[PDB]
Amino acid sequence: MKRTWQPNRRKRAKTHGFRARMRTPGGRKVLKRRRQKGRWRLTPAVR
Amino acid sequence: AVKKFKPYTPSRRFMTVADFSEITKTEPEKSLVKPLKKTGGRNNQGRITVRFRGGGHKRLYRIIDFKRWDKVGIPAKVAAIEYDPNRSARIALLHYVDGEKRYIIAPDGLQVGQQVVAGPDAPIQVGNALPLRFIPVGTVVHAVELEPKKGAKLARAAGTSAQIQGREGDYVILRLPSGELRKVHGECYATVGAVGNADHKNIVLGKAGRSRWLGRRPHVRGAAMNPVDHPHGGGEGRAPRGRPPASPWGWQTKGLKTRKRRKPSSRFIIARRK
RNA sequence: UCGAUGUCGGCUCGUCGCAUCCUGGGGCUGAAGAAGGUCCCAAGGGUUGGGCUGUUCGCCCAUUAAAGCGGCACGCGAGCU
RNA sequence: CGAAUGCCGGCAUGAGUAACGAUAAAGAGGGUGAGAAUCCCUCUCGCCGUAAGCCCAAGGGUUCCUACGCAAUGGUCGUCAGCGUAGGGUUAGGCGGGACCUAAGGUGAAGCCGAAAGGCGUAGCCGAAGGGCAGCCGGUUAAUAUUCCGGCCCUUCCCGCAGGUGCGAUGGGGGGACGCUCUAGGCUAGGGGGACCGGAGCCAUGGACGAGCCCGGCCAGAAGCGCAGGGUGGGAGGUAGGCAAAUCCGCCUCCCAACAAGCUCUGCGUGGUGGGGAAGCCCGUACGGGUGACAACCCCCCGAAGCCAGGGAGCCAAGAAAAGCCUCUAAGCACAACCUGCGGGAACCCGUACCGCAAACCGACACAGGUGGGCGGGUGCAAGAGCACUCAGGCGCGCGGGAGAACCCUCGCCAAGGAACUCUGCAAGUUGGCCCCGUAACUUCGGGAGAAGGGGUGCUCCCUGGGGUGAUGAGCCCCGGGGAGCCGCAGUGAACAGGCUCUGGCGACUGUUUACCAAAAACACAGCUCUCUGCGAACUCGUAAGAGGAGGUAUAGGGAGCGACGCUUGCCCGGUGCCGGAAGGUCAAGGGGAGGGGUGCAAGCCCCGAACCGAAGCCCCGGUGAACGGCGGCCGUAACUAUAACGGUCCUAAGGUAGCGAAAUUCCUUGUCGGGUAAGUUCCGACCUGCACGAAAAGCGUAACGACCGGAGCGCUGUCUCGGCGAGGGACCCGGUGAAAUUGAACUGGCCGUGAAGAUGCGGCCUACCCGUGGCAGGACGAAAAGACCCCGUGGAGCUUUACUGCAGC
RNA sequence: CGAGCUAGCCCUGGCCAGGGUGAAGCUGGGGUGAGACCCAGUGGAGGCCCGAACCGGUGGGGGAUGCAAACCCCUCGGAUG
RNA sequence: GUGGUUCGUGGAGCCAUGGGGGAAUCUGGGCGGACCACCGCCUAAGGCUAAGUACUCCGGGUGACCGAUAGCGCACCAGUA
RNA sequence: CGGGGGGAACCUGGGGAACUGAAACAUCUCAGUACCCAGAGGAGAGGAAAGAGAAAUCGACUCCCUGAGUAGCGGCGAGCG
RNA sequence: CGCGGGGUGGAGCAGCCUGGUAGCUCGUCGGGCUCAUAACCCGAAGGUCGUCGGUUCAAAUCCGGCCCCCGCAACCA
RNA sequence: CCGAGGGUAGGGCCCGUGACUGGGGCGAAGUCGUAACAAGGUAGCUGUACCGGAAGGUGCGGCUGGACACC
RNA sequence: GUGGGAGAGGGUGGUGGAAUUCCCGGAGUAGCGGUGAAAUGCGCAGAUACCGGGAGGAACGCCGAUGGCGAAGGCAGCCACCUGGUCCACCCGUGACGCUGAGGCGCGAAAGCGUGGGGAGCAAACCGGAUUAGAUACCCGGGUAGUCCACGCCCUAAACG
Ligand SMILES: [Mg+2]
Ligand SMILES: [Mg+2]
Ligand SMILES: [Mg+2]
Ligand SMILES: [Mg+2]
Ligand SMILES: [Mg+2]
Ligand SMILES: [Mg+2]
Ligand SMILES: [Mg+2]
Ligand SMILES: [Mg+2]
Ligand SMILES: [Mg+2]
Ligand SMILES: [Mg+2]
Ligand SMILES: [Mg+2]
Ligand SMILES: [Mg+2]
Ligand SMILES: [Mg+2]
Ligand SMILES: [Mg+2]
Ligand SMILES: [Mg+2]
Ligand SMILES: [Mg+2]
Ligand SMILES: [Mg+2]
Ligand SMILES: [Mg+2]
Ligand SMILES: [Mg+2]
Ligand SMILES: [Mg+2]
Ligand SMILES: [Mg+2]
Ligand SMILES: [Mg+2]
Ligand SMILES: [Mg+2]
Ligand SMILES: [Mg+2]
Ligand SMILES: [Mg+2]
Ligand SMILES: [Mg+2]
Ligand SMILES: [Mg+2]
Ligand SMILES: [Mg+2]
Ligand SMILES: [Mg+2]
Ligand SMILES: [Mg+2]
Ligand SMILES: [Mg+2]
Ligand SMILES: [Mg+2]
Ligand SMILES: [Mg+2]
Ligand SMILES: [Mg+2]
Ligand SMILES: [Mg+2]
Ligand SMILES: [Mg+2]
Ligand SMILES: [Mg+2]
Ligand SMILES: [Mg+2]
Ligand SMILES: [Mg+2]
Ligand SMILES: [Mg+2]
Ligand SMILES: [Mg+2]
Ligand SMILES: [Mg+2]
Ligand SMILES: [Mg+2]
Ligand SMILES: [Mg+2]
Ligand SMILES: [Mg+2]
Ligand SMILES: [Mg+2]
Ligand SMILES: [Mg+2]
Ligand SMILES: [Mg+2]
Ligand SMILES: [Mg+2]
Ligand SMILES: [Mg+2]
Ligand SMILES: [Mg+2]
Ligand SMILES: [Mg+2]
Ligand SMILES: [Mg+2]
Ligand SMILES: [Mg+2]
Ligand SMILES: [Mg+2]
Ligand SMILES: [Mg+2]
Ligand SMILES: [Mg+2]
Ligand SMILES: [Mg+2]
Ligand SMILES: [Mg+2]
Ligand SMILES: [Mg+2]
Ligand SMILES: [Mg+2]
Ligand SMILES: [Mg+2]
Ligand SMILES: [Mg+2]
Ligand SMILES: [Mg+2]
Ligand SMILES: [Mg+2]
Ligand SMILES: [Mg+2]
Ligand SMILES: [Mg+2]
Ligand SMILES: [Mg+2]
Ligand SMILES: [Mg+2]
Ligand SMILES: [Mg+2]
Ligand SMILES: [Mg+2]
Ligand SMILES: [Mg+2]
Ligand SMILES: [Mg+2]
Ligand SMILES: [Mg+2]
Ligand SMILES: [Mg+2]
Ligand SMILES: [Mg+2]
Ligand SMILES: [Mg+2]
Ligand SMILES: [Mg+2]
Ligand SMILES: [Mg+2]
Ligand SMILES: [Mg+2]
Ligand SMILES: [Mg+2]
Ligand SMILES: [Mg+2]
Ligand SMILES: [Mg+2]
Ligand SMILES: [Mg+2]
Ligand SMILES: [Mg+2]
Ligand SMILES: [Mg+2]
Ligand SMILES: [Mg+2]
Ligand SMILES: [Mg+2]
Ligand SMILES: [Mg+2]
Ligand SMILES: [Mg+2]
Ligand SMILES: [Mg+2]
Ligand SMILES: [Mg+2]
Ligand SMILES: [Mg+2]
Ligand SMILES: [Mg+2]
Ligand SMILES: [Mg+2]
Ligand SMILES: [Mg+2]
Ligand SMILES: [Mg+2]
Ligand SMILES: [Mg+2]
Ligand SMILES: [Mg+2]
Ligand SMILES: [Mg+2]
Ligand SMILES: [Mg+2]
Ligand SMILES: [Mg+2]
Ligand SMILES: [Mg+2]
Ligand SMILES: [Mg+2]
Ligand SMILES: [Mg+2]
Ligand SMILES: [Mg+2]
Ligand SMILES: [Mg+2]
Ligand SMILES: [Mg+2]
Ligand SMILES: [Mg+2]
Ligand SMILES: [Mg+2]
Ligand SMILES: [Mg+2]
Ligand SMILES: [Mg+2]
Ligand SMILES: [Mg+2]
Ligand SMILES: [Mg+2]
Ligand SMILES: [Mg+2]
Ligand SMILES: [Mg+2]
Ligand SMILES: [Mg+2]
Ligand SMILES: [Mg+2]
Ligand SMILES: [Mg+2]
Ligand SMILES: [Mg+2]
Ligand SMILES: [Mg+2]
Ligand SMILES: [Mg+2]
Ligand SMILES: [Mg+2]
Ligand SMILES: [Mg+2]
Ligand SMILES: [Mg+2]
Ligand SMILES: [Mg+2]
Ligand SMILES: [Mg+2]
Ligand SMILES: [Mg+2]
Ligand SMILES: [Mg+2]
Ligand SMILES: [Mg+2]
Ligand SMILES: [Mg+2]
Ligand SMILES: [Mg+2]
Ligand SMILES: [Mg+2]
Ligand SMILES: [Mg+2]
Ligand SMILES: [Mg+2]
Ligand SMILES: [Mg+2]
Ligand SMILES: [Mg+2]
Ligand SMILES: [Mg+2]
Ligand SMILES: [Mg+2]
Ligand SMILES: [Mg+2]
Ligand SMILES: [Mg+2]
Ligand SMILES: [Mg+2]
Ligand SMILES: [Mg+2]
Ligand SMILES: [Mg+2]
Ligand SMILES: [Mg+2]
Ligand SMILES: [Mg+2]
Ligand SMILES: [Mg+2]
Ligand SMILES: [Mg+2]
Ligand SMILES: [Mg+2]
Ligand SMILES: [Mg+2]
Ligand SMILES: [Mg+2]
Ligand SMILES: [Mg+2]
Ligand SMILES: [Mg+2]
Ligand SMILES: [Mg+2]
Ligand SMILES: [Mg+2]
Ligand SMILES: [Mg+2]
Ligand SMILES: [Mg+2]
Ligand SMILES: [Mg+2]
Ligand SMILES: [Mg+2]
Ligand SMILES: [Mg+2]
Ligand SMILES: [Mg+2]
């Protein structure tokens, strides 16, 4: 039956993207935390 | 007057369609005078601020002329009477001698082919438009400005009209289609006649779906809802209203007068429909 | 027994008690015969089909030698419903 | 450390157990190899064929191709692979995106708002599966190809030359530019037939050398033409509108055309030309290469939903924008610039392999699930994308071999009976397509209706009607009509394809719902009523700005009940709510300063503070029932008896009207009577003693409708009496792979006792050699879930209100 | 941090074999003082009918350490709204 | 009308200020806990100002700190799979 | 010419909870804590008396000790201080 | 069993709360008006207050027991 | 072939009959009122509508088959 | 036919004044209404009676008759338009063209009905006051359908001379 992951490469980038985060103070913090933790990807990689 | 159908379906029986024989044009509208529009019921927050709205036919918005006065004195000939989906009434196409085209909301008994003018000058004849001060008392009248040079607000809807009871100072006394009695300023343009398509009130939607075409979505009663949702709901196997009847937001809906008290507008009203 | 002992009825499969419905055997009778009454012995076997109701029960139809009453976590849901 | 259903890890038990993932299906021969049911090749057999074939978009990301590999991955095996290692492989001015347009939305000079972060917002900008734009047919590679090659077309920039013209834009105007259903004429795609054209070969097994059989009979193609279409009037005058300017467009008038007549654009066709080009046979292929050939290359018919395309009609719910494009003028320039034609040159970035209904995507899996667009051939059956078989193509579903128990699942059939089964005909069965005959109550006249019930149904020969395309002719195709016959149990001969009727309840109806235990009588619904709302509307969201409402304006918009339609919807305004009420009463801050206090020598400073004036609200006065709601008790009475039209008396704000009533409501109750049945707690019809119906939380009906729920009959049945047999897939046996919950340890019997009250484990007695396999579930108070019920906890949470106390709002 | 599931709305595209029924209108005849009307033809309406795709999810069986954390078979609802 | 202080409206001053009213310049103004007198303190409505203080990404030194189930989550290519 | 953004913790400022405690709970506590925002730096804040507050006394600010769990504050409760 | 109100001239109601006295309508009886009857007028009569205890000086009145009456409740199971 | 008739299916009409139900007729002396007959004590009757135990009342319109004081 | 007549004959559109009700304004005070008598009601929150203003609906006083017109039902302020019947005069035309009329068609007071409007006065039903034994009546105070208009039905009557 239809499930919860229906990948679409564009939806991913406008949602969890890098300029998405950068646009909002909640999201700038997301990067901040992610970066401070030493995360290898700061933001999902989408092809 | 009101097309009716044989009942070759259920809901074809009581269904009733407007008589369109008034329509002289169809499938325009003058492509120069109209943009598009949209909404959803939702406001700029993405939020439903008016419930039960959406679906319903695509519509082009015919731009129409609620100031007749910017054009004082230039007559115009009535080219067509066509179908405005954005209102109860029908719009009249009029070509001015200016060569300018405008839409007007079409009065009952406005003939395609006749001439209309607007200004203090004007003959008191259907379709013309004047300052209120220059219309003779008793004249029934429609598309009225509430304030000078601000556009036609009052009596625009199919079959509506208004009446001049008298005159007081800079103000004339008007009976509105509500029946309320109001003082409107002398200088306010108004166009003589009633609005027509009067038979509007007699159409019978007749099936559910036809209510959807007008973009009205279903209306669910508090009465059948749970308490989170509405002041009427729960406990069921039905229930009376169990309290004085309320809106979803909780204020009372039979009798409560919601007009603000301290409005300056108040010293310009004399009566009741609200 | 609440860190679970699934609850009515039906179906299936039974098994047991006897305070015996039938059949066998008896005493008494207000037992002429036939047929009953009532009590005694007796658990070997047997104890119908159907209408109504979820019903157990009960009422009813048509038969029967008879159309017994109880126990088994109101026997039986790691057997079904 | 021994316990925490402890934590982390290791290893046991179940156990060689269950499974090994669609019942489309396999067999052999040969090859390779250490090793073969499982890899390769052939032959045979089966499965898909509106697909299980082919193409596109997502998404995936090297899975593609080839060589060498087999440890793991693969539910077995693997010599194979989507797996390991390595090497190769994706080629574009024209296909898709971008150096174009704008849509919702987003963002946002201006501006607005907000403690901060930020929210908004005209224009602009961004944003596409929409608008716009120039490539078609072959061939080639192990692997890409409208990308490379061959062939024939085309577009935009730059520069030049020639000719032409008031040139000129971001500004004006036109256009772009539009719905749904039905649909004309002509074409094309595709398809069938041909006695005609081309072709290896074939005569089998009784017959056939044949107008036999089998295979093929096309594809792209500028200009020109031809056919079918789309679009489209011409000229002058006047002009005050299209925020400047127009010569353009709008409007008025005059003059010829009504017509594609022209001009113009597009479809097909034909086109110089380029290219394909079967069976079969030989060879050799994860595959496809020679020949067949010098291939043929044509007629007829069927025919789109595609094309001409902005076609046509009808209807109402009334059906994007912006650029490209054309025009018009403005500055500015008229050397320029633009326009047309020709010519040279210039033409960037990114995608391009492969999977794609799936073993490569979403589902932890090589998961019976889910996934958008296009093509999707043949025959037969009324049609069809249905169904059966079948082409191209693809597959036999990555454990097998046997056996032929119980039992299970899926399926076939049955004497006599026919619902007796059972909560219930649940389930199965009957019915079944088409044509013709025929068809009731009732009805809102449409319906009810496929009502019901019937008859027909194939093959052959004979005569005949109209249509299409040709010609008004044959031939091909379509729709028929009448007559005589043959065969079987049977002609919708297989497959797909309603069982019907009577009658109640509830909801008018089509719709909607608890994703994943309820599809309903619940919600919605047209429609009725009340109520608010004069427009900077009420209402909603927001702190605001702002927005929705609505670019709407009372024939509108918001709230609330009711719920098609019919006939109706009674009485009560005492309480509550709302509505109205310019008096009155009370009432907060404030105004007022009678009088009183502190202190100071004092001038003073300072603190109280009564009268009285002083909102909303409340009180008070009314109103108001499709506002919250509410609509009696006891006692007597008629010349049989009964019963009470009638009276009496208490209380009320007023005492339940009409309808209906043992009801989706009736406790007593299986009320009583009638009906149906041999028998009826249900069902239907009555009565009325309505525990405890009753009129928009509507009353009573109502044709039609319903996967709703109840009752009854016909038909038919394995539902049953009552079982039997048969099929296949498991189950069993053999080889390969091999889990799980659970598990204090076990050397784990019956009875009668006992015991924390239900003992394998204590007492007595009885019985009992050791160990398994297939089976059934009585027991281990069997597994699972720290019982959801119940109570406890001064535990939570959702909900309500005339609980308390705040807050928003007003 | 989430509307890549699910709910509603907005913008822009697409899909719905085949059959059946035969509304208004139009035309013609009848009718009449003129009508309403009637009949025949044409016509092609509809939250109309049957039924694939598609969308569902009625009843029953199977599954229940599943093929599957909602599946499978049979049947069944809608199918121009 | 509130906030701060130990100050929760209390006899509630002080410091601060959202609203209303609203001065003076040394004989002027603030304070010593309501207010008054006396007696004292101090000079608001402009600004800057080292050091003594806080902390530990980083470098060092030290440990009756751990020794791979410890010690950081990471002794190991870990904020990784 | 300058600004913008980043920095483990530390600092100032704008805003600012609840569980909890009070063995229920409103004032009160937790607590101006957590957290969000803006700013600053290697520190930051503060700072040169319209101060204290009884002595005719001390002299800017900050940090430690003590004063002191004192003065007080408080459903005069819990507790705060 | 449970909670709540109740029982008073023939009928139907007050009175009891807060002790001292029994009241209102109808009916009944006597008289009147009328041919007559009812209506109507004038007069009367009738009750130990469910019952049995108890409290007080005194009980329809306040307390208890039994008998009845109406109402309410009987849920999770 | 047609054919008495039999059988299956669906209609029409007519009779009988049915819990109960509706009103009607009739019945020496039942209960309730007084509608009508005299201006019948509200003139009557009337079609229609609503209401009421009952006769009846009231609305609207109609008919006469109803009308010596007095303002 | 010609010429002339009377008339609330019918349909459409307008329009006038009296009065009633309500609203506003002024003035003014203690009652008003109503009956058989009263009460309910209305009134010091300023009624009634008076003047001024405005809104709205219905019906047309005198003329009016004991009259006119129409087939009937029916028809009454004024004006215009469209239109029916009918009488008189003259003897001009046609030349029995007549009468009646089962069916059919049409009209048809009031009430009633449907969908809209409109709603002042009136007023079934309803409520209250009074009368009565009682009163679901008569009288009085309120009062909704209806009364009016458009369209569409219904088709009755002491539709009577
Ligand atoms: Mg997941
Ligand atoms: Mg995408
Ligand atoms: Mg890295
Ligand atoms: Mg937003
Ligand atoms: Mg609703
Ligand atoms: Mg609900
Ligand atoms: Mg919510
Ligand atoms: Mg609520
Ligand atoms: Mg409620
Ligand atoms: Mg409930
Ligand atoms: Mg209820
Ligand atoms: Mg338990
Ligand atoms: Mg257990
Ligand atoms: Mg015995
Ligand atoms: Mg004997
Ligand atoms: Mg025995
Ligand atoms: Mg029983
Ligand atoms: Mg029996
Ligand atoms: Mg049991
Ligand atoms: Mg079970
Ligand atoms: Mg059971
Ligand atoms: Mg068990
Ligand atoms: Mg221990
Ligand atoms: Mg466990
Ligand atoms: Mg093992
Ligand atoms: Mg085993
Ligand atoms: Mg096995
Ligand atoms: Mg397999
Ligand atoms: Mg070999
Ligand atoms: Mg096929
Ligand atoms: Mg490969
Ligand atoms: Mg291997
Ligand atoms: Mg393997
Ligand atoms: Mg460029
Ligand atoms: Mg753009
Ligand atoms: Mg923004
Ligand atoms: Mg695009
Ligand atoms: Mg392109
Ligand atoms: Mg190609
Ligand atoms: Mg064909
Ligand atoms: Mg031969
Ligand atoms: Mg060609
Ligand atoms: Mg011009
Ligand atoms: Mg201009
Ligand atoms: Mg060609
Ligand atoms: Mg067209
Ligand atoms: Mg055309
Ligand atoms: Mg030009
Ligand atoms: Mg110039
Ligand atoms: Mg490629
Ligand atoms: Mg699939
Ligand atoms: Mg597909
Ligand atoms: Mg594959
Ligand atoms: Mg994958
Ligand atoms: Mg899964
Ligand atoms: Mg597999
Ligand atoms: Mg799959
Ligand atoms: Mg997968
Ligand atoms: Mg699909
Ligand atoms: Mg077929
Ligand atoms: Mg197709
Ligand atoms: Mg098929
Ligand atoms: Mg096997
Ligand atoms: Mg077998
Ligand atoms: Mg049989
Ligand atoms: Mg039979
Ligand atoms: Mg039963
Ligand atoms: Mg069935
Ligand atoms: Mg019938
Ligand atoms: Mg049939
Ligand atoms: Mg035959
Ligand atoms: Mg044959
Ligand atoms: Mg043809
Ligand atoms: Mg079939
Ligand atoms: Mg069928
Ligand atoms: Mg029933
Ligand atoms: Mg329904
Ligand atoms: Mg629902
Ligand atoms: Mg659920
Ligand atoms: Mg569900
Ligand atoms: Mg359903
Ligand atoms: Mg379901
Ligand atoms: Mg707000
Ligand atoms: Mg708008
Ligand atoms: Mg309802
Ligand atoms: Mg209902
Ligand atoms: Mg009511
Ligand atoms: Mg009543
Ligand atoms: Mg009330
Ligand atoms: Mg009141
Ligand atoms: Mg009230
Ligand atoms: Mg006052
Ligand atoms: Mg003193
Ligand atoms: Mg007040
Ligand atoms: Mg009152
Ligand atoms: Mg008697
Ligand atoms: Mg009953
Ligand atoms: Mg019964
Ligand atoms: Mg009941
Ligand atoms: Mg009962
Ligand atoms: Mg019944
Ligand atoms: Mg009810
Ligand atoms: Mg109600
Ligand atoms: Mg009913
Ligand atoms: Mg019904
Ligand atoms: Mg349905
Ligand atoms: Mg249903
Ligand atoms: Mg069987
Ligand atoms: Mg042993
Ligand atoms: Mg024991
Ligand atoms: Mg022992
Ligand atoms: Mg067992
Ligand atoms: Mg057990
Ligand atoms: Mg527990
Ligand atoms: Mg407590
Ligand atoms: Mg609690
Ligand atoms: Mg979505
Ligand atoms: Mg079709
Ligand atoms: Mg069709
Ligand atoms: Mg159709
Ligand atoms: Mg349909
Ligand atoms: Mg789907
Ligand atoms: Mg199902
Ligand atoms: Mg589903
Ligand atoms: Mg099972
Ligand atoms: Mg449907
Ligand atoms: Mg269907
Ligand atoms: Mg269809
Ligand atoms: Mg639609
Ligand atoms: Mg404070
Ligand atoms: Mg306090
Ligand atoms: Mg203080
Ligand atoms: Mg001084
Ligand atoms: Mg001073
Ligand atoms: Mg100060
Ligand atoms: Mg001081
Ligand atoms: Mg002091
Ligand atoms: Mg000082
Ligand atoms: Mg360090
Ligand atoms: Mg470690
Ligand atoms: Mg170690
Ligand atoms: Mg670790
Ligand atoms: Mg702070
Ligand atoms: Mg606490
Ligand atoms: Mg506590
Ligand atoms: Mg608590
Ligand atoms: Mg604090
Ligand atoms: Mg510093
Ligand atoms: Mg504190
Ligand atoms: Mg007497
Ligand atoms: Mg309960
Ligand atoms: Mg009378
Ligand atoms: Mg009388
Ligand atoms: Mg009388
Ligand atoms: Mg009356
Ligand atoms: Mg006249
Ligand atoms: Mg003559
Ligand atoms: Mg003659
Ligand atoms: Mg009439
Ligand atoms: Mg009338
Ligand atoms: Mg009288």
Torsion of CA B119, B124, B127, B130, to 10 degrees: 30
The neighbouring-strand residues paired with B163 are B140, B175
Torsion of CA B96, B98, B100, B102, to 10 degrees: -40
Return the DSSP state at B118.
Answer: B
The neighbouring-strand residues paired with B42 are B48
Residues with CB under 7 A from strand G: A 25, 28-29, 32, 35-36
The tokens describing B184, both together, are 């409107």
**B146: nearest Cα among B264, B274, B64:** B264
Asked if B120 and B160 touch (Cβ cutoff 8 Å), the reply is: no
Q: Ligand 46 centroid to B15 CA: how many Å?
A: 29
3-state secondary structure at position A34:
helix
Half-sphere exposure of B219 (CA within 13 A, CB side): 7
Q: What is the largest CA-CA distance in chain A?
A: 40
Distance between the alpha carbon (CA) of A8 and the C1' atom of D20, Å: 37
Asked if B216 and B51 touch (Cβ cutoff 8 Å), the reply is: no
Enumerate residues 6+ apart whose C-beta is below 8 A from B131: B120, B186, B187, B188, B189, B190
How far is Cα B215 from Cα B234, in angstroms, rounded to an integer?
Answer: 30
Solving technique: X-ray
Q: Which H helix or E strand runs over A33?
A: helix A25-36
- CA-CA-CA-CA torsion sign (B53, B57, B61, B62): negative
Amino acid (one-letter) located at B13: R
Neighbour count for residue B157 (Cβ, 10 Å): 16
Resolution, expressed in angstroms to one decimal: 3.2
How far is Cα B150 from Cα B188, in angstroms, rounded to an integer?
Answer: 8
Asked if B195 and B105 touch (Cβ cutoff 8 Å), the reply is: yes
Give φ, ψ of B191 to 5 degrees.
Answer: -120, 125
Return the DSSP state at B42.
Answer: B
Distance between the alpha carbon (CA) of B7 and the C1' atom of D657, Å: 38
The tokens describing B54, both together, are 């959406």
Q: How far is CA B199 from each of CA B153, B175, B202, B204, rounded to the nearest angstrom?
A: 22, 21, 6, 11
How far is Cα B178 from Cα B180, in angstroms, rounded to an integer?
Answer: 5
How far is Cα B197 from Cα B1, in angstroms, rounded to an integer?
Answer: 9
Q: Ligand 67 centroid to B237 CA: how many Å?
A: 29
